Amino acid sequence: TLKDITRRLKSIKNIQKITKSMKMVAAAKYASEQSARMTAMDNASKNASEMIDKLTLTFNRTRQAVITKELIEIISGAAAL
Amino acid sequence: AKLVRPPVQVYGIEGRYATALYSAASKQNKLEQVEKELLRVAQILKEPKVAASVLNPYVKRSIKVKSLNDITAKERFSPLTTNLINLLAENGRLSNTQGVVSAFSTMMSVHRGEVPCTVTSASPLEEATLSELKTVLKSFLSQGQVLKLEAKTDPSILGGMIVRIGEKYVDMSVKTKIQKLGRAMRE
Amino acid sequence: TGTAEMSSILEERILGVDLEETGRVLSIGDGIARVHGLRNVQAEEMVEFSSGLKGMSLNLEPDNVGVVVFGNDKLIKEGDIVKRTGAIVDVPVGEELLGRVVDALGNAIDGKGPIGSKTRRRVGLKAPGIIPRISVREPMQTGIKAVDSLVPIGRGQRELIIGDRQTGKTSIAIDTIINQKRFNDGSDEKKKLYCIYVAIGQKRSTVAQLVKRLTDADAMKYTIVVSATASDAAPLQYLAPYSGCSMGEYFRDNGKHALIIYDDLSKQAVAYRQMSLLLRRPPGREAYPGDVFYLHSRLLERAAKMNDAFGGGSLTALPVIETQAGDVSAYIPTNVISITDGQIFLETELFYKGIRPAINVGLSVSRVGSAAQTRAMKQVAGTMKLELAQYREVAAFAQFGSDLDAATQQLLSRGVRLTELLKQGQYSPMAIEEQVAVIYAGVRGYLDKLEPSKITKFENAFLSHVVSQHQALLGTIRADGKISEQSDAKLKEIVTNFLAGFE
Amino acid sequence: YFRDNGKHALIIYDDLSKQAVAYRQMSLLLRRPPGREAYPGDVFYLHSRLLERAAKMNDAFGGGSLTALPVIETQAGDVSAYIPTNVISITDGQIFLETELFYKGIRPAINVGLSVSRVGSAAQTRAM
Amino acid sequence: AATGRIVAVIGAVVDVQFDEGLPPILNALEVQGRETRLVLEVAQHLGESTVRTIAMDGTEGLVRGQKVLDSGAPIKIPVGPETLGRIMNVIGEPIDERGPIKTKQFAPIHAEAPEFMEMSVEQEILVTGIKVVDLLAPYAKGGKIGLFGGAGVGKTVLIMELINNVAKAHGGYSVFAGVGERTREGNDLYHEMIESGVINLKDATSKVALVYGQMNEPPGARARVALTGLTVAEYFRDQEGQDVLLFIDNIFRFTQAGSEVSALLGRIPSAVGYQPTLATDMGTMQERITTTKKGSITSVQAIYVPADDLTDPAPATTFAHLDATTVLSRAIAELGIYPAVDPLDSTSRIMDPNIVGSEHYDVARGVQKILQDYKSLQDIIAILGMDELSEEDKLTVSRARKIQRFLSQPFQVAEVFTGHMGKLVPLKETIKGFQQILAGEYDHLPEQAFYMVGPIEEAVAKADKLAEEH
Amino acid sequence: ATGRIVAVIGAVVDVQFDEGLPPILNALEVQGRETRLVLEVAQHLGESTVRTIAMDGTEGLVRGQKVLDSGAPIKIPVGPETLGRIMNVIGEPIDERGPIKTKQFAPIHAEAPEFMEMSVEQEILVTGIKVVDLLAPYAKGGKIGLFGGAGVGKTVLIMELINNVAKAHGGYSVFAGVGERTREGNDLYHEMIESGVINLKDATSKVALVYGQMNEPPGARARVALTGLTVAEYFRDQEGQDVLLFIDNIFRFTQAGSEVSALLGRIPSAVGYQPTLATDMGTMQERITTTKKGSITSVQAIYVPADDLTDPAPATTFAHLDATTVLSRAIAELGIYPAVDPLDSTSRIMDPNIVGSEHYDVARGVQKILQDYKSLQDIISEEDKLTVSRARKIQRFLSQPFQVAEVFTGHMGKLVPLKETIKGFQQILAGEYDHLPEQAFYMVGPIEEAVAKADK
Amino acid sequence: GAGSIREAGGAFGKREQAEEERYFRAQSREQLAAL
C-alpha cells in the first residue's frame, strides 16, 4: 500500500538522520566506548540509507502502479457507456 | 411538437425512423399509401443494382442522395416517403432502409389488429382440427383482432399442442405433463 | 443511435424555423445542453437560452452543440429555444471596477449599482509574445519578510503559493494586497499596484470576510474582487480566472501595474474537469482532460512585464494551489509548478512549530531572484540566505549541538536567530526599509547574545524605536534604495545603542 | 528452417521488452483491456508461442535444433515485474547482469548466485 | 398535470416517458399503483420525451408502462413549528407513527443559496464546555463546524455531547438530520431526546426536529435527506428569524449516494470513483447551510473519512466549506484519550488574537507548539531512549504528556463507556489550566492525574488521592 | 482540395472533404481567419472526414468554414537565413524582424536515414570544454542528456557549445524551445544577443531559434521539436555540417505527445502516457544521427518526474541517450564553472575501443582520484594528503573560462583541444605539478596557462 | 516528517512507546511518593 510505504520511508529517513547525528556526537566525544559508538552509528546510518534506497524504489513502483490502476478504472467506466 | 406514438414500439435506428414516419403519416392519415410505397421502395433497393449502388461507402453521399431522389420521383412516390428516403440518404442510414420498412410494416400490422399466433405440434396437424383450433383461438382476442397463425411442427413434444397467442401461452404438450409427473415423483 | 436522430426531428423532416441563429435543446443534464441547429455558432461563443440563462458553445459536433449552462438545469427543458449572441465571451474592464465585487462575468454582486465601465475585453485573448516583453526587473513588494528577502517577486513574475489546506496561503495573498497601500497613496506613479483577487469555489462567507478585511485595511479602493463561489456553475468557476486576467490585462496594457491572485487554481481545474467529463471528452490521469495543462498555461502566460515601447506596464500573477498531504507530484500541482517562475511553499509542521508564515525556505524558490529586489534588501538578504542554508545543513544536529564544535554551534545559533526574525504577524505588512533594518540587525550579529524567546520582542521594540526616532535614515534608505556607507554606519550606531539599552 | 532441415541455429531477440511495448501499443490502439502495467492479457502468449519454437529435435525429425537467447531489460534491477517474470516462466534459465557489478568493473557483470541453466548441465563437456 | 409511463428500470434509476408536458429537472414524480408512496426525482432530460429519474424508495415491483404523475414542483416537505418533536423522512412523511404533520406551509427541498449581500461577518465564540475544542479550535455562533473522523473514532459520541451541551443550553429550535447512518443510533437519539425533555411527546414544547434517511435507504433518499433537514432549518432561520442549530450525521453519505447513482445516470467516473459533479453538488448543498442577515444557523456536521485518508475527495472538498474543522485522530483514540481530537490538525477561523484575546491565543499556540516539539522529540526517544535527553527536553516531554492527558475530558454521554462522570468546563477555566501547565506549575504532579478530569482543581484532587493510595 | 469543418471539440477539428482526401500528417489551412490557423491531419475517420489537431487556438471556428489542403506536411523555411531568427512550429517569424527569405522549404515530417546511410563507427565530437571532452565525451550524431536547471549556468553552457561548435567544426546550431516559458524565451533571446551568438546586424549568427510556447495547444508543442529537427536536417544534408540541436525540454515533448494522444481519444498506457510513447520518441530521435553528408548532435534537457528515473518518460528517453552532462549546484557553490558534476556525468563512448586507451586511462584515473578524494573528505594519513592535493588540483583544472562570458567577467575564453586536455590531466596525475599552488589551475585553459599563472 | 518513527508503528515505534511509559511510570511513582 502506498501509505504504508510512505510511513516506512519517513520512519527510516528519521532513523538515518538521528544515527548520523549520533555518529557526529560520538566523534566529538571521542576526541574506546566512544569509538565503538561512532562506528556503530556510522553502520546504522549506512544500513538505514540502504533500506531507504530499496524503499524508494518500491515506493516509485507502487505509485506508478496506483496511477495506472486509477486510469484503467476511469477508462473502463467510460467505455461501458 | 407532439408526436403520435404507434401501437407497438420498435427501437434502434429502424425503430426511430419508423416511429417518425408513422407519426408523420397519421398526421395526414396516409398510412396505407406510404405502407405500400415503402414496400415498393424496399423491393426497388433490394434488387442488386440499387443495393450495390447505395451500399457502396466510397462513392460520395450526395451522389447517391441525388440518385435516390431521382428513383423515388421516377416511381411516383408521395412527398412523405420521398423526403423520408432523402432523410435516410443524408444521415447515411440507407443500409437501415429494409429495417425501417420492416418496423413500419409490423407497426401497421399490429395497427390492423394482427396477432402472431404459433401452434407447435408433434405431427402435421389435421386441417378441420386446425380450423376448429382457429375458431377456439379467436376467443382469446379483443375485438378488431385477427389471428396470423403459423404452425410449425416439433415432434419432440410427444403430443398435444403448444399455443402462443402473442405473449399468452398455454403448454398443452404431453411432454410437459410427463416432466411434471417426473418432478412430482422425484420430489 | 445519434443525438439528432430523435423521433421529433426526424418526423418534422418527414413532414417537411431558422436553424442558423437559433437552436432547440435535444437533451439537458448536469449543466450540459445538447442543442440542435445553431449551424452558424462559433466555438466558445456565448449563447442565450429561452429562460434567460446564458451558455457557451464548447463542443461543436456534426449534429448537435454541446453548451455549458451558466446556471441551474431546472430552467432548461427539452425543446427550449437557444439564440446566438454572435460574440465570444467578454467582460467589462477599466478603473470603474476598482472597489467592486463582481462575478465571473463582471456583474456587480455588492449592490452598489452597475459597473459604469466603457470598455470591454475578451476573456480569451492570447498572451504577449516574445518581443513585447522585457525582463522582470522591478520589485513587487509583499511586505512579508520571508518572501521579500528569500523568495523575492518581481513585477511581471508568476509566483505560486502552494501548500496544504489551512497553511496560510490566502493570508500571504491578502498581506500582499494590503501592503500596496503605501505605494497607492503616495505620488510615485510607477510604484502603484492595482490588485485583483479572484475567488474560485469558495464560500460566500469567506469572500465576505475577505472583503471586510480589505475594507478595514482600506485596500478595497484599488482592488477588484472576482468571485465564482462554490454554489456557482462550473462554467463560471472555469471562466472567473480569465475574467480577472482580462481586468488586469487592461492595466498591463495601459502602462500600469496589476497583481492578480487566483485563489485557487485547484478548484478551477476541478470545475473544468467536471465540464469536460460531462461533455464526454476523453479523460486522462485523475480523470482530467487532455488540455488542462493548456488551460492553466494559457491563463498564466498572460502575466507579463511589457517593454517601454508597449507602455512599460506589467501583470504579476500569484496562483494558489492546494496540495493533498504535501503531494506536489499530483497532476495539477505538477502542471502549475511547471508553468510558474517559482513557488512559495507552506508547511503544516512549520505552522505548528511557531513559524508563521510557514514558508519552507528550502523548498521555496524564485527563478527571477535578486533581479526582483532592491539593492538594500539584496545586500542583507544575500547574507541571510547563505546563513540560513548553512543552518539547514546542520539543523539535524540540533538537540545534540551542545556537544559539537564552535562552528556548528555558531551556525545553529545564527540560524535560530534568523528563523525567529522571519516570523511575522497577520495583516501587518512591513515597508522594505523596516525589513532591511531588521534583517541588518539579524545578519550582522547583534542578536547572537540574545535569547531566542526574546528575538520577537526585540524586533518589535527596535522597529517601533527606529520608526519613531529615526525617520531620517529610513527615508534615506527608501529614497536611495541602497544602504550607503553613511547609512550603514548610522544603522550600526542605532542598533548597537539600542541593544545596549535593550532589556 | 535450419531447425527442421537438420541444422542448428541460434537466435537472439534483442530485446523482447521493446517487442512487448510495441504489442502493448498495438493492443491499446485496438481498445483492448489493459492489465498489469497497461499490458494486454495475452502479452504472455505473445512471448510463449515464440520461445516455444526453440527446440531440440529427435533424430527422426532431423536432429537439428534452434537455440534462443531472448533479452529483457529491467527497471532498477526489478526482476519481479510483469514482463521479466513472464519470460522467466517461459525460458529454461536466465543470465542475470547486475549494474552494481558492472560499475565495479566486474565484466561480464554476471551474477553467479542468481543465474542458472536448468537443462544446460547435461550439455557441458567433460573437461569443462 | 402531466402523466408519463415507466420505460426502464435499472436499479434505483427509472426512466419515464411523457407524451404531453415534460416535467422540469428536480421535479418530484408520483408512481401510481403502489401501496406505499414512491417518489421519483427528475435528474436528466434524455430527449425523445424521456426523463431519467432517481427513486426515493425501492424500485422492486415497478413495471414498464406503469403510470407516473407529475407533482409540478420539487419534493415539498412540511415546515413550521409542527415539525418539532416529529421524525420525518426524505419526502416529509412522519416515521414516528404519531400521525400526519399538520403544518400551514410546505417548502421545496431545492432552493437557491443566499446571495453575497445576505452574508454576515459577525464572529462570536460559542463555548461548548469541551476543553480541546474551546481552547485550540473554538466554534462560532452561526458558523459551520464539521467533525472529521474515520470509523469508530468518536464522531457520533462527540455530536451527541454537543447536542446535549449546546442544544439544551440553546433556546432556538435545533434540527438533526440523520444522513445514511445506523438506525439503531437514530432510535437511541430519539429516546435520549424523549427522556431528556428535549422532545415532548405530550404537551408539545419540543425544540428539535428530526429528519432520518438511514443506510437501508436507496441512494436517492440518502442524497436528498440532507436537503430535507436543511429545508426545515432554513424555514426556522428565514421565516422566523430564529437562531437555529443544524446537526448532520453523516454528511459524507450525501456524496456517497451521489457516487452510487453517478454511473447509472450516464456519467464517466471521476477520480476515486466519485461523480464528476462532487464539488458542485457539495457546494449547492453546503452554501444554503449558512448564517444570513435574516437569521443564524449554527451547523455541526459529522464527516466520515474513508480509511482515515483526509485526502479523499469527499472530506478534502468538505474542508473549504467550514469555519471550524475538528479532526478526530485514530492514533489519539488508541492512546485512550477521548475526545480523539487532533490538536495539530484542528483549525478555527476565530482563533485570532483580535477575536478571542491574547491570553487565549497565546495559550493555544503554546500548547500546539509544545505538542509539535513533543512529536519531534519522540524520534530521538525512539533511537536513544528517554534517559539520554537533556533535562529541558525531558521537561518538554513531561509537560507535553501532561497537556495531552489534560486535553481529554469525560463526557456526559460517555458514562456507559468511561464510567467516569461528565464534566462541562468553562472557557476561562480551560485557558487557566493550560496556562498553568505550560508555565510549569505542576511539574511535581504525575501525568496520570490530568487524564479524564475537568478543570485543574480536579487534577490536583486526583493527584492527591493517587498519592494517598499509591 | 477544399474541405469544411464538421466538428470543433477543443483543439481537435474534424474536416470533411468532398474530393481529394488529404493524407495523414498533411497541414490544412483554415480560411477566413486574421491569423494563420493550421490543422494537421491525424486520422481518416471514414465518410470523407479526417480528424485533425490544431496548431493554434480554435475559438471562433464555425462548422462549415472552408479549409484548404496544403498538399504536404507543415513546411518551414530552411536555410542560412533562419540563423539568428525565431520561428514558431509552422515556420513563421515570431521576432518581428520581417519574413524569413529562404529559397526552399522542408516538410517537418521525414523518415529517418536509411540503414546504408549510417556511420559504422562512433567518433567523438570535441567541444573544447575540458570536463566534457575528458570525462563524458559527446559522440557525433548522439543524444546528450543535460541535467540540472536554474542557477548552474545551463544557458552559458548552451551558448558556449554553440560558439565552440561554430568555431571548431564550422557547424551551426538549432535551439528548439519545446514548451518554452515566454519570459525565459525572451531572456534566452537577449542573452544570445548579448553574447554575440545571435547577431541582429550581419549574417554572423550561429544559432536558429524555434519556439513552441507553453500557451500553445499540445499539437504545436508536439511538433516544435520536429520543426527544429528539420532546420538542423537541412544544415546537415545540404551543407554537410556537424550540427548541434538543442531540445529544451524533452520531457515537455513527451508531455505534449501524451496530451495530443489523450485528445484523440486513445487509451492511455502506464502512468497515463500515450500508448505510442516509444514510437513517438523513436521517430523523433532516429532523425538525430550521423549520415554520410554530416551529422546532428543533440543536447536535450532532461526533467525527471517525481525524481523517478524508472518513470516511462525518462526511461524511454534514456534508451536514446549516448551521454549525460550533470550540472550540479554542489559544484557551482564550490566555485567551479562550468558546474558539470565530473563523477555523475557519463558517456557511452568512454570506451578504450572508441576513444583510445590513452584517453580512457586518463579519464579513469581522474575519476578514481576524485572518488578517492570524496572518500577522504568524508573522514576529515601518509600519501592520502598527496591524493587530496592532486584531487584539489584536478578539481580546479576541470574549470574553464568561456568566451560567451568574456564581456561580463573580463577573462578570455578558452577552447582547449582534446590532446591538450588529455595530456594536461595526465601530467597533473603523474605529479609533474605537485609544487604549483592549487589556485594556479583555477579558471585556465591548457596546462601551460596553469604554469604561466603559477609564475605570477 | 516529525514523529514519523512512532506514526509508522514499527518495531521502533513500539520501542519508543515502551520507553516513554517505563520512564514516566518510574517518575510518577517517585512523584506520588513525595506527593
Ligand SMILES: Nc1ncnc2c1ncn2[C@@H]1O[C@H](COP(=O)(O)OP(=O)(O)OP(=O)(O)O)[C@@H](O)[C@H]1O
Ligand atoms: N502569519 C500568520 N500568523 C498567525 N496566523 C496566521 C498567519 N497566517 C495565517 N494565519 C492563520 O492560519 C489560518 C489559516 O490561514 P489561511 O486560511 O489564510 O490559509 P489557507 O491555506 O488559504 O486556508 P484554506 O485551506 O481554508 O484555504 C488562519 O486562521 C490565519 O489567520
Ligand SMILES: Nc1ncnc2c1ncn2[C@@H]1O[C@H](COP(=O)(O)OP(=O)(O)O)[C@@H](O)[C@H]1O
Ligand atoms: N468521548 C468518548 N469517550 C469514550 N469512548 C469513546 C468516546 N468516543 C468514542 N468512544 C468509543 O469509540 C466508539 C465509537 O463511537 P462513535 O461515536 O460511534 O464513532 P464514529 O461515529 O466516528 O464511528 C464508541 O463506541 C466508544 O467505544
Ligand SMILES: [Mg+2]
Ligand atoms: Mg484559502
Ligand SMILES: [Mg+2]
Ligand atoms: Mg457514527
